[PDB]
Design an enzyme around this catalytic site. Structure first.
Site, PDB file in Angstrom:
ATOM      1  N   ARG A  89      27.590  10.103  -0.353  1.00  0.00           N
ATOM      2  CA  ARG A  89      26.841   9.358   0.658  1.00  0.00           C
ATOM      3  C   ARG A  89      27.448   7.984   0.937  1.00  0.00           C
ATOM      4  O   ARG A  89      27.646   7.605   2.098  1.00  0.00           O
ATOM      5  CB  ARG A  89      25.386   9.217   0.197  1.00  0.00           C
ATOM      6  N   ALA A 136       3.271   4.046  -2.467  1.00  0.00           N
ATOM      7  CA  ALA A 136       2.944   4.815  -3.665  1.00  0.00           C
ATOM      8  C   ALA A 136       2.743   3.915  -4.876  1.00  0.00           C
ATOM      9  O   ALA A 136       1.855   4.164  -5.704  1.00  0.00           O
ATOM     10  CB  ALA A 136       4.033   5.852  -3.946  1.00  0.00           C
ATOM     11  N   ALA A 137       3.575   2.877  -5.022  1.00  0.00           N
ATOM     12  CA  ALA A 137       3.448   1.984  -6.168  1.00  0.00           C
ATOM     13  C   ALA A 137       2.098   1.269  -6.158  1.00  0.00           C
ATOM     14  O   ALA A 137       1.373   1.270  -7.160  1.00  0.00           O
ATOM     15  CB  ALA A 137       4.593   0.963  -6.172  1.00  0.00           C
ATOM     16  N   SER A 147       0.817  -1.209   0.000  1.00  0.00           N
ATOM     17  CA  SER A 147       0.000   0.000   0.000  1.00  0.00           C
ATOM     18  C   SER A 147       0.852   1.261   0.000  1.00  0.00           C
ATOM     19  O   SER A 147       0.444   2.288   0.545  1.00  0.00           O
ATOM     20  CB  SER A 147      -0.944   0.012   1.197  1.00  0.00           C
ATOM     21  N   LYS A 159      -0.241  -3.899   5.148  1.00  0.00           N
ATOM     22  CA  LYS A 159       0.248  -4.570   6.351  1.00  0.00           C
ATOM     23  C   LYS A 159      -0.185  -3.847   7.621  1.00  0.00           C
ATOM     24  O   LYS A 159      -0.383  -4.486   8.661  1.00  0.00           O
ATOM     25  CB  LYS A 159       1.774  -4.695   6.307  1.00  0.00           C
ATOM     26  N   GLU A 183       9.737  -0.808  -5.549  1.00  0.00           N
ATOM     27  CA  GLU A 183      11.015  -1.246  -4.989  1.00  0.00           C
ATOM     28  C   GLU A 183      11.144  -2.767  -4.933  1.00  0.00           C
ATOM     29  O   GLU A 183      12.267  -3.285  -4.967  1.00  0.00           O
ATOM     30  CB  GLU A 183      11.198  -0.629  -3.606  1.00  0.00           C
TER      31      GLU A 183
HETATM   32  N1  LIG Z   1       7.305   2.871  -5.500  1.00  0.00           N
HETATM   33  C1  LIG Z   1       7.697   3.591  -4.301  1.00  0.00           C
HETATM   34  C2  LIG Z   1       8.017   2.613  -3.173  1.00  0.00           C
HETATM   35  C3  LIG Z   1       7.148   1.381  -3.224  1.00  0.00           C
HETATM   36  O1  LIG Z   1       5.986   1.456  -2.745  1.00  0.00           O
HETATM   37  O2  LIG Z   1       7.618   0.355  -3.771  1.00  0.00           O
HETATM   38  C4  LIG Z   1       8.900   4.471  -4.595  1.00  0.00           C
HETATM   39  O3  LIG Z   1      10.037   3.990  -4.596  1.00  0.00           O
HETATM   40  O4  LIG Z   1       8.749   5.667  -4.844  1.00  0.00           O
END
Ligand SMILES: N[C@@H](CC(=O)O)C(=O)O
Length: 481
Positions: A236, A18-19, A16, A38, A321
């Site tokens: 970094r 952004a993706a 849940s 989750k 991700e």
């Molecule tokens: N897609 C998202 C993270 C995720 O929910 O996988 C991002 O890296 O901006």
């Protein structure tokens, strides 16, 4: 054995962030979507070149050009959805969509594959078993397509910037379903996370060092000039390696970040929010050093997908991700993680839409096994193993690597796998056991990718192979070999 599923949808989205939520809004225009949560819910050419440089030479150029070409239109789509103020819009929209059911406090257990129930045709995902935490039972969800959007695997490490979205469950479930994974040695660490019992993964920004903060050993001395002429202004990954070295060499719990030599007005003016959060925890940014440790932050590898976000298993997609697209190569360029989940979400939606009429519903699915074994003391050992895994990954597949350290990690991971098989078989499902199983599974894949790479490149830094190979590529693991 076979029973009517408790849940049914056209698209099951696991995760849940952004993706997951942005893909949910796309698909729910036409399809019944369940979202499992989750917890509580420059030119194209220069972007391409910058991405390739950041990836240290092993980006898949096809994927880089795919994302860079479609970035602007996919970001415009996101804006038109009504835009972490992105999360505020996405969460509100997802919770107020007639065709989205958000299931909170539910953990996917494993994917249900067609060939395990005698369904004809090439093997495809047909649903998932889901652990309902409030009901403490395993339910079956029928789905015509399943999308993994679970985030990365940073929780295999004892320090992590975002623990609630980094358990690796999507990677482990895809591996168990027969998907290739790749590039799991390329794990980004944030150099300066607050080290404090009530830190709640608070991050000290690199802006502090940009304005002249020093990085200090416990004894007060500065270590960065000793290893890099740029001092605290080094890149970094160089800062993270130096902190890791000092901590392990000195047996120190943390290093320290200190701007106290700057005037107090300078500190309060430039970092009001940081100064406010730290005094609330009993630390004065204008007088004393702030304890810091590195923290695992982002997983550049993951489940292998094509241009449509398709995994190796029909009906099963992975975006964000959790996925390996080839976009990142050996490191991550800032803005690419959001662009990746928008562009691959768009292409996954196109494929899922076009595939949907050919998928027929399944009216009965294999129920979860009784799983009634219960020993209270053995249940406590699951927690010991969880901590043991996260510490050994920090020590042995961490920021600075060696071949012999990786050997020690694989030995311990293999032991934990065998113990999990031997001791927790048919144990009643619990959140802790699911997480342990998945963390150990993904740790195995991480260390096997790290062992494959006989060079230092990007986020993979090994003392035994300090140079880059002339020719290289991704590290790919197959569960079918
Ligand atoms: N897609 C998202 C993270 C995720 O929910 O996988 C991002 O890296 O901006």
């Amino acid at each position: 054995m076979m029973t009517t599923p408790e849940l049914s949808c056209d698209v099951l989205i696991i995760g849940s962030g952004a993706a997951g939520l942005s893909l949910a809004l796309r698909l729910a225009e036409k399809h019944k979507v369940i979202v499992l949560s989750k917890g509580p819910v420059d030119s194209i050419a220069s972007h391409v070149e910058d991405t390739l440089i950041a990836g240290a030479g092993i980006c898949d150029r096809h994927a880089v050009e795919f994302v860079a070409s479609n970035a602007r239109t996919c970001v415009q789509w996101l804006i038109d959805q009504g835009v972490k103020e992105v999360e505020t819009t996405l969460v509100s929209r997802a919770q107020n969509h007639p065709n989205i059911q958000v299931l909170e406090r539910s953990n996917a257990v494993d994917l249900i594959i067609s060939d395990k129930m005698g369904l004809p045709g090439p093997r495809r995902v047909v649903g998932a078993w889901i652990w309902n935490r409030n009901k403490e039972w395993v339910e079956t969800c029928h789905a015509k397509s399943v999308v993994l959007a679970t985030g990365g695997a940073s929780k295999v490490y004892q320090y992590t910037t975002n623990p609630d979205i980094s358990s690796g469950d999507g990677i482990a479930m895809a591996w168990r379903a027969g998907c290739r994974v790749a590039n799991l040695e390329f794990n980004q660490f944030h150099p300066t996370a607050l080290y404090h019992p009530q830190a709640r993964n608070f991050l000290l920004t690199e802006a502090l060092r940009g304005e002249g903060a020093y990085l200090k050993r416990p004894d007060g001395s500065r270590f960065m000039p000793d290893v890099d002429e740029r001092g605290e202004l080094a890149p970094r990954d160089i800062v993270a390696r130096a902190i890791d070295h000092e901590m392990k060499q000195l047996g120190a719990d943390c290093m320290f970040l200190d701007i106290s030599h700057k005037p107090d007005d300078f500190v309060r003016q430039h970092f009001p929010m940081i100064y406010a959060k730290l005094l609330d925890l009993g630390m004065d940014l204008t007088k004393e050093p702030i304890p810091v440790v590195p923290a695992a932050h982002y997983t550049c590898g993951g489940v292998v997908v094509d241009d449509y976000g398709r995994t190796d298993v029909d009906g099963l997609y992975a975006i964000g991700e959790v996925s390996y697209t080839g976009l990142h190569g050996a490191n991550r360029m800032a803005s690419n993680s959001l662009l990746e989940c928008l562009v691959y979400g768009w292409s996954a939606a196109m494929d899922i839409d076009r595939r949907m009429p050919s998928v027929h519903s399944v009216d009965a699915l294999p129920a979860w096994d009784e799983s009634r074994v219960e020993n209270a003391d053995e249940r406590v050992v699951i927690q010991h193993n969880w901590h043991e895994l996260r510490l050994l990954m920090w020590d042995y597949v961490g920021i600075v690597r060696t071949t012999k350290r990786l050997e020690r990690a694989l030995r311990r991971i293999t032991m934990l796998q065998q113990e999990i098989d031997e001791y927790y078989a048919n144990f009643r499902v619990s959140n802790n056991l699911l997480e342990l199983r998945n963390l150990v599974q993904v740790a195995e894949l991480i260390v096997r990718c790290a062992m494959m790479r006989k060079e230092s490149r990007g986020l993979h830094f090994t003392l035994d192979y300090p140079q880059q190979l002339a020719e290289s590529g991704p590290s790919i693991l197959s569960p079918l070999t």
